[PDB]
Amino acid sequence: MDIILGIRVQDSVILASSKAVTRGISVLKDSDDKTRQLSPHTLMSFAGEAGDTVQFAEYIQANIQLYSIREDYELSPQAVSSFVRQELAKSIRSRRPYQVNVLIGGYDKKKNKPELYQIDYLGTKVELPYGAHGYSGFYTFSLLDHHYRPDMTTEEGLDLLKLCVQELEKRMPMDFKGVIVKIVDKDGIRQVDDFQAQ
């Protein structure tokens, strides 16, 4: 599967997601952005079944934007994830289930604290300091378990991720063509356009 990493530091959430999109024997694209912005302060990365992956992401995005308009308000990260878990939990017992796994990272402007949610296609949600979907966790959790600290700075977090990505590039069989990193904090969502060598 694709790499979907997430880590919640002191004042933000960082999402690293591989850029490769392989179909069969050829790597069709090496610049894929496996993420959608649900609201100014909430970002969701995803990995899974070919078509469902994006379809689901865009479907959730559309709904959140609609809610935002209707109530002229931005749902809390928690709210958004509970909405997403419910969607996946429905999809699991449906005719053709959405096989998509997601990471939702957002900054709760009311609580002034960053939050990271991990939800698998079964609608299994759990909140963490750092999470990952698929095999990604197997290679990186021992590192994060080790170097993770609640008070880490956004810069320390990126350093830890870089470390993880390196272990991933070393022991993992597939070339995921590197990752795209994004920060979600009190000021919104921005992309670290320089991780190809940070």
Partner: protein
């Protein structure tokens, strides 16, 4: 299961339920819209049949269907909610499938269509509403101002008004709006709006709410003061003569 044809033709070729829907609009609070050279302004009067309200929560008259388009109306409030909801959803749907937010015209054409449908469908009565839809097309700076009515008809205007005494205020606008030189400033555009509402609101600093829409999702509603200031500067224009 109820499909009684409520909107039907009469011997003179009229559809009374639609005509009556209009009568409901006449009774609604006035609403006005004027387009500048780089903006559009929406004004609406606030009733006073009962005052002791909680303005913070009491549903406002100008609504956003999206971040770049707004819609005001005159008529039954409850009816307006239904149209606004559908409009907002169609807005998000359009972005989802076309990968581009709706143009003002398109969004107007949609709302109008919804209305027209209620004029020839069984078991339902027409909307007792008329609307002003304003905003800026994506990546476009030319302002847009549209209007719709229960009949389902719609068209764009340089400035227009609907609601009680819209007759009066339209005149004001007809002899105070030069297409040659439309209000080239957000300030002078908003002023012309207030001036038109004053023709009917009869001193109502709290009875007048203005919302200014600029290109690229730049929408903002004025506060009593901001508006109050425009009124003040306008009453002086009169006395100074």
């Amino acid at each position: 299961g109820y499909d009684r044809a409520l909107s039907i033709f009469s011997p003179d070729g009229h559809i009374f339920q639609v005509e009556y829907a209009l009568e409901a609009v006449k009774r609604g609070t006035c609403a006005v819209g004027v387009k500048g050279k780089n903006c559009v302004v929406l004004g609406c009067e606030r009733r006073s049949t009962l005052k002791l309200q909680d303005t913070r929560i009491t549903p406002s008259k100008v609504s956003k269907i999206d971040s770049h388009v707004v819609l005001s109306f005159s008529g039954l409030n409850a009816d307006s909610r239904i149209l606004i909801e559908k409009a907002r959803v169609e807005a998000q749907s359009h972005r989802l499938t076309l990968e581009d937010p709706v143009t003002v015209e398109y969004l107007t054409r949609y709302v109008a269509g919804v209305q027209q449908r209620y004029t020839q469908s069984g078991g339902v009565r027409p909307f007792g509403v008329s609307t002003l839809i304003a905003g800026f097309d994506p990546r476009d700076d030319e302002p847009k101002l549209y209007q719709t009515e229960p009949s389902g008809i719609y068209s764009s205007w340089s400035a227009q008004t609907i609601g009680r005494n819209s007759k009066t205020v339209r005149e004001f606008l007809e002899k105070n709006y030069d297409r040659k030189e439309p209000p080239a400033t957000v300030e002078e555009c908003v002023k012309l709006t207030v001036r038109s509402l004053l023709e009917v609101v009869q001193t109502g600093a709290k009875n007048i709410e203005i919302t200014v829409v600029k290109p690229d999702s730049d929408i903002v509603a004025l506060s009593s003061e901001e508006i109050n200031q425009y009124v003040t500067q306008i009453e002086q224009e009169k006395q100074e003569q």
